[PDB]
RNA sequence: UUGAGCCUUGAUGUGUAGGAUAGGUGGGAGGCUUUGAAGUGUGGACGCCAGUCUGCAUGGAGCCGACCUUGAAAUACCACC
């Protein structure tokens, strides 16, 4: 079995002298599914940029077979904001597209004999023969079959003027359309709702080729991955498995490093206490000894763990009128959001907003933050509300500037309501404890964007939270301390999720997002939201289609 | 001792580098500098390496 | 029926001689068909790679047995010429309107190198369809009289299949061992000539014969 | 008793439009089945749930192409696939 992939040996260092990976040596074997796990920091992506071919400066050797093509979907995808669907798309075609081109002005040829045939007419067939590679004359064909079975946008609409799960799939879809053999994935689900991340969890699982895939969640890791690199500090450990025996596996780790740990400082403390004694007479006391505990005395890297201390600062206090929508109606050319929404968001309440991509529910948080104007009127907030937003994306940071001035502005004290904080304090309040002050947001990581983001946005000070996708890049354990001080907060918050356990762990009102424009709100828990829908409730369970790829 | 080493490598094609270093937490961007290159003898752009 | 006794007879677990195995291919008499064949050949080049796709035209001593009707989408003064030279369906560019609906269907695409204004259908509807030669296939050159010829002696083009694989016909049963060895000569050395910049293995990786009914024996 | 590989024999390929599950070029004409059917009753398997493949039973000669309004054509072989 010839391997697909392979590494010996391979260490990369960061800034200062931080062995994120070292020694990781393995073998990529075909048809295998990788799940690679890990913290927010702990060097996923890295290990991923390596194995793309765009990380060189890497220590050891990696290198895939030759031959094979290696697709990789970055967790930062990029598109061109000019550019439409169409205008994005093709460029994952753009062999065919340019050689049909070409094709079109070689054919002039034959109109006017000027350089007949010994100049062009040669290179016409290789022409031809890029064509022949592919399908090429049936390309428009292959484009709609991509686009309906991802459920893209039609051709017409922009980029910018994009939802952020129809970004995703545009990524998705050019990535798909080079049609790779090994297929590398950072964050593949990240603002995909439930039947886009199914769709693509059964597309994987059908993948021929080599999938190696970035993944905070459990339930698609179970789905697609066949064994998981937990991918620690600095060590990659394998595991054949599922992801609760792979917890299992990572605690017993965890607790038998804990108890060596203190073990060792068991032992520093007694040598100490053994050098701290004097000679008695002209003997020994001996240099072996002290060679022994000057080598005992070493370092060990602590787990980087976020855990229990998002910092969500307590706002003004609310009064009992908080917000009331009326007859809510939102359109945009020919299809219609919104249509007659009225609610109103009694005060302490935590309000899960669910629904299918771009099915309005940032526009709703642009409407109640005031950056749009909807149709139909009527949004209304008490006077005691203050609004504080945190934005689907990350594209306002200066890149440039170090976490505690962008976070902070530079001001040793900051400034949070009432109260007057230390700055360096409240930064470190979000798990930047040490000199990871001193880290440039443009070298942070995905989930420490999305940690640096939360606290940036929350020391406005509102009593109103406007969350959209507030757990995208996050860990499980930043995810957890959220939730908590998501429950332990005296306003109200109203969060856009695609994580129902996360969002069922928190809601107390269900505002969920239907077809035909239609905003079902309930006030209740996911619990009783769907024992509501059982009551009165519709007989049929099936819904996707599992359309294909190829042909 | 958080200056790295860092070489400065010639774009004018030829094997030939500058060396120095640079705080490479404070200043990720690469190094670029017009400086003089004996193999070709023009000053050109030189731009950090390994 | 005939089938689930020519597997009986068969024993395609060998490889065979080219002409060890023109006798049975003859033995498959027991049939009935009009027993074309559908000549088969491999090769060890990569269909996804475009620098080992490979196409291109031959000319064989005694043809396919059928008729192909070549078009010439060079009308004018030299209009006359394609329709007495062999031009089975004579339509100029500027007179495709009417010949082009009246005939839905042909043995090979026009091809005029003197003149070839026409695109045809404005999204591959003919290209990609295959019959839509190019000139660098043999199809449009200066001469006209080329088109006619290769029409008239049944010139057949490669085509690569996904994997690589080659297919040609050389004719009915009615053709001899000589005869089918040496169109078989001419198609291999014409595939020597055509192998890619790429030559992994063995340039025929497989090569079988078969009918249109019967079975396929490799040829070795 | 197994694990892996290889050769064969099968089985398998639901986008939209289309008569209805259409893998790819074929390359050609009609063959298939009557060496007993286009079916009804029955049993398993697949099942993108439409459905086509299947072991049977008396009855055993009619199912598709060809015709085209679909990017493509009709398990109507052996193929190297
Ligand atoms: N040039 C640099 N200097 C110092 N530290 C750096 C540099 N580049 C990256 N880092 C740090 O390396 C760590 C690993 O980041 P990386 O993106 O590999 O993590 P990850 O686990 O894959 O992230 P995520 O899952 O959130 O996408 C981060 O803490 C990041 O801040
Ligand atoms: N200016 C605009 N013109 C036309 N269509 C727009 C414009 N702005 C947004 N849209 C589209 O309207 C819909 C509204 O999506 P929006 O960005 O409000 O979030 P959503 O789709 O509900 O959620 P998510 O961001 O989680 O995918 C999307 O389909 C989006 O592409
Ligand atoms: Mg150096
Ligand atoms: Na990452
Ligand atoms: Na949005």
Redesign the interface.
């Given at each position: 079995a010839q391997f697909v992939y392979t590494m010996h040996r391979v260490g990369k260092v960061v800034?200062?002298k931080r062995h994120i990976l070292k020694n990781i040596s393995l073998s990529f074997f075909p048809g295998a599914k990788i799940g690679v796990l890990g913290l927010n920091g702990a060097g996923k992506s890295t290990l991923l940029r390596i194995m793309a071919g765009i990380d060189k400066?890497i220590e050891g050797e990696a290198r895939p077979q030759p031959?094979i093509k290696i697709g990789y979907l970055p967790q930062e995808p990029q598109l061109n904001p000019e550019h439409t669907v169409r205008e994005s798309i093709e460029e994952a075609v753009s062999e065919v597209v340019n050689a049909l081109k070409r094709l079109?002005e070689v054919?002039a040829?034959?109109?006017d004999?000027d350089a007949?045939?010994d100049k062009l007419?040669?290179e016409?067939?290789?022409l031809?023969?890029?064509i022949?590679?592919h399908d090429?004359?049936?390309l428009?064909v292959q484009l709609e079959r991509a686009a309906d079975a991802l459920r893209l946008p039609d051709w017409d609409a922009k980029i910018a003027n994009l939802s952020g799960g129809e970004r995703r799939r545009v990524a998705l879809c050019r990535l798909l359309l080079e049609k790779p053999d090994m297929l590398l994935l950072d964050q593949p689900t990240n603002h995909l709702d439930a039947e886009s991340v199914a769709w693509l969890e059964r597309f994987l699982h059908d993948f021929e080729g080599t999938v190696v895939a970035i993944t905070h969640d459990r339930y698609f890791l179970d789905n697609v991955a066949g064994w998981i690199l937990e991918l620690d500090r600095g060590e990659g450990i394998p595991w054949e498995g599922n992801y609760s025996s792979w917890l299992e596996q990572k605690d017993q780790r965890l607790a038998q490093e804990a108890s060596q740990e203190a073990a060792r400082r068991k032992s520093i403390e007694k040598e100490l206490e053994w050098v701290r004694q004097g000679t008695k007479g002209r003997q020994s006391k001996g240099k072996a000894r002290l060679a022994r505990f000057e080598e005992l005395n070493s370092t060990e890297y602590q787990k980087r763990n976020e855990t229990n201390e998002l910092f969500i600062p307590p706002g003004p206090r609310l009064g009992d009128k908080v917000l009331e929508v009326s007859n809510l109606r939102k359109s945009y050319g020919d299809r219609l959001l919104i249509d007659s929404l009225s609610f109103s968001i009694p005060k302490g309440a935590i309000v899960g907003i669910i629904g299918p991509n771009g099915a309005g529910k940032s526009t709703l948080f642009r409407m109640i933050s005031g950056q749009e104007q909807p149709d139909s009127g009527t949004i209304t907030l008490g006077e005691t509300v203050k609004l504080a937003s945190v934005d689907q994306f990350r594209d306002s940071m200066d890149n440039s500037k170090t976490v505690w001035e962008e976070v902070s502005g530079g001001l040793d004290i900051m400034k949070i309501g009432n109260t007057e904080m230390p700055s360096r304090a409240y930064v470190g309040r979000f798990n930047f404890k040490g000199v990871d002050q001193?880290?440039?947001v443009?070298?942070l990581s995905g989930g420490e964007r999305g940690r640096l983001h939360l606290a940036k946005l929350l020391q406005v000070g509102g009593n109103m939270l406007l969350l959209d996708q507030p757990t995208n890049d996050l860990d499980i354990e930043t995810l957890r301390a959220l939730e908590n001080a998501l429950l332990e907060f005296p306003g109200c918050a109203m969060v856009i999720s695609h994580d129902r356990w996360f969002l069922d762990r928190i809601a107390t009102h269900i505002l969920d997002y239907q077809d035909e424009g239609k905003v079902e709100f309930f006030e209740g828990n996911f619990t009783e939201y769907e024992e509501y829908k059982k009551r009165t409730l519709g007989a049929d369970a099936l819904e996707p289609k599992r359309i294909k790829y190829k042909r | 001792g958080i200056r790295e080493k860092i070489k400065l490598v010639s774009s004018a094609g030829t094997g030939h580098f500058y060396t120095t270093t640079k705080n490479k937490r404070t200043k990720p961007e690469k190094l670029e500098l017009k400086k003089f290159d004996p193999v070709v003898r023009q000053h050109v752009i030189y731009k950090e390496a390994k | 029926k005939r089938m689930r006794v020519i597997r009986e007879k068969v024993d395609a677990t060998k490889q065979y001689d080219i002409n060890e195995a023109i006798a049975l291919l003859k033995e498959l008499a027991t049939a009935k068909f009009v027993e074309s064949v559908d000549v088969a050949v491999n090769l060890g080049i990569d269909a996804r790679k475009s620098d080992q796709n490979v196409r291109g035209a031959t000319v064989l001593p005694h043809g396919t047995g059928r008729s192909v009707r070549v078009a010439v989408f060079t009308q004018g003064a030299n209009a006359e010429a394609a329709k007495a030279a062999g031009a089975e369906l004579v339509g100029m560019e500027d007179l495709a309107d009417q010949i082009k609906k009246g005939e839905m269907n042909f043995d090979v695409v026009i091809a005029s190198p003197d003149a070839m204004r026409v695109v045809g259908q404005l999204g591959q509807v003919l290209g990609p369809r295959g019959l839509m030669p190019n000139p660098k296939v043999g199809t449009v050159t200066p001469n006209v009289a080329e088109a006619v010829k290769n029409a008239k002696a049944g010139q057949v083009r490669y085509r690569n299949d996904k994997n690589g694989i080659i297919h040609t016909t050389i004719g009915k049963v009615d053709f001899d061992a000589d005869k089918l060895k040496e169109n078989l000569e001419a198609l291999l050395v014409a595939l020597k000539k055509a192998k890619p910049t790429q030559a992994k293995g063995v340039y025929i990786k497989k090569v079988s014969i078969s009918t249109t009914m019967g079975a396929g024996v490799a040829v070795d």
């Amino acid at each position: 079995a010839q391997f697909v992939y392979t590494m010996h040996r391979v260490g990369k260092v960061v800034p200062p002298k931080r062995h994120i990976l070292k020694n990781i040596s393995l073998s990529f074997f075909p048809g295998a599914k990788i799940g690679v796990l890990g913290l927010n920091g702990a060097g996923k992506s890295t290990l991923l940029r390596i194995m793309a071919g765009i990380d060189k400066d890497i220590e050891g050797e990696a290198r895939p077979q030759p031959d094979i093509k290696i697709g990789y979907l970055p967790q930062e995808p990029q598109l061109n904001p000019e550019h439409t669907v169409r205008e994005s798309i093709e460029e994952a075609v753009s062999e065919v597209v340019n050689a049909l081109k070409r094709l079109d002005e070689v054919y002039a040829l034959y109109a006017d004999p000027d350089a007949d045939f010994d100049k062009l007419a040669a290179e016409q067939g290789r022409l031809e023969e890029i064509i022949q590679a592919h399908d090429g004359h049936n390309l428009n064909v292959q484009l709609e079959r991509a686009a309906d079975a991802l459920r893209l946008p039609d051709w017409d609409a922009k980029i910018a003027n994009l939802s952020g799960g129809e970004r995703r799939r545009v990524a998705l879809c050019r990535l798909l359309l080079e049609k790779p053999d090994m297929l590398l994935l950072d964050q593949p689900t990240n603002h995909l709702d439930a039947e886009s991340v199914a769709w693509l969890e059964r597309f994987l699982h059908d993948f021929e080729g080599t999938v190696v895939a970035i993944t905070h969640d459990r339930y698609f890791l179970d789905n697609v991955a066949g064994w998981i690199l937990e991918l620690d500090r600095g060590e990659g450990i394998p595991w054949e498995g599922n992801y609760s025996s792979w917890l299992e596996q990572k605690d017993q780790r965890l607790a038998q490093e804990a108890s060596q740990e203190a073990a060792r400082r068991k032992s520093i403390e007694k040598e100490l206490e053994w050098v701290r004694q004097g000679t008695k007479g002209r003997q020994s006391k001996g240099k072996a000894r002290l060679a022994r505990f000057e080598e005992l005395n070493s370092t060990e890297y602590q787990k980087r763990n976020e855990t229990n201390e998002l910092f969500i600062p307590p706002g003004p206090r609310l009064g009992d009128k908080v917000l009331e929508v009326s007859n809510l109606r939102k359109s945009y050319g020919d299809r219609l959001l919104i249509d007659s929404l009225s609610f109103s968001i009694p005060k302490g309440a935590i309000v899960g907003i669910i629904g299918p991509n771009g099915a309005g529910k940032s526009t709703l948080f642009r409407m109640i933050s005031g950056q749009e104007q909807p149709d139909s009127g009527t949004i209304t907030l008490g006077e005691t509300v203050k609004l504080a937003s945190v934005d689907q994306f990350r594209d306002s940071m200066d890149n440039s500037k170090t976490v505690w001035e962008e976070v902070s502005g530079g001001l040793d004290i900051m400034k949070i309501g009432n109260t007057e904080m230390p700055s360096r304090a409240y930064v470190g309040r979000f798990n930047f404890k040490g000199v990871d002050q001193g880290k440039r947001v443009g070298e942070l990581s995905g989930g420490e964007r999305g940690r640096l983001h939360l606290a940036k946005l929350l020391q406005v000070g509102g009593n109103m939270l406007l969350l959209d996708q507030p757990t995208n890049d996050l860990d499980i354990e930043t995810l957890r301390a959220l939730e908590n001080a998501l429950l332990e907060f005296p306003g109200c918050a109203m969060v856009i999720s695609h994580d129902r356990w996360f969002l069922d762990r928190i809601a107390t009102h269900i505002l969920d997002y239907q077809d035909e424009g239609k905003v079902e709100f309930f006030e209740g828990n996911f619990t009783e939201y769907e024992e509501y829908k059982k009551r009165t409730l519709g007989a049929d369970a099936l819904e996707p289609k599992r359309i294909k790829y190829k042909r | 001792g958080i200056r790295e080493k860092i070489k400065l490598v010639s774009s004018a094609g030829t094997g030939h580098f500058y060396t120095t270093t640079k705080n490479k937490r404070t200043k990720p961007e690469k190094l670029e500098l017009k400086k003089f290159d004996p193999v070709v003898r023009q000053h050109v752009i030189y731009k950090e390496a390994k | 029926k005939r089938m689930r006794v020519i597997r009986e007879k068969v024993d395609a677990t060998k490889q065979y001689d080219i002409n060890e195995a023109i006798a049975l291919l003859k033995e498959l008499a027991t049939a009935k068909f009009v027993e074309s064949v559908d000549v088969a050949v491999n090769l060890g080049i990569d269909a996804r790679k475009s620098d080992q796709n490979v196409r291109g035209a031959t000319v064989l001593p005694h043809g396919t047995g059928r008729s192909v009707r070549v078009a010439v989408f060079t009308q004018g003064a030299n209009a006359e010429a394609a329709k007495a030279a062999g031009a089975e369906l004579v339509g100029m560019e500027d007179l495709a309107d009417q010949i082009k609906k009246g005939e839905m269907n042909f043995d090979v695409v026009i091809a005029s190198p003197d003149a070839m204004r026409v695109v045809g259908q404005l999204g591959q509807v003919l290209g990609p369809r295959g019959l839509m030669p190019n000139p660098k296939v043999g199809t449009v050159t200066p001469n006209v009289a080329e088109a006619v010829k290769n029409a008239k002696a049944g010139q057949v083009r490669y085509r690569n299949d996904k994997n690589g694989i080659i297919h040609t016909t050389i004719g009915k049963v009615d053709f001899d061992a000589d005869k089918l060895k040496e169109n078989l000569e001419a198609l291999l050395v014409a595939l020597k000539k055509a192998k890619p910049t790429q030559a992994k293995g063995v340039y025929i990786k497989k090569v079988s014969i078969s009918t249109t009914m019967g079975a396929g024996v490799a040829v070795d």
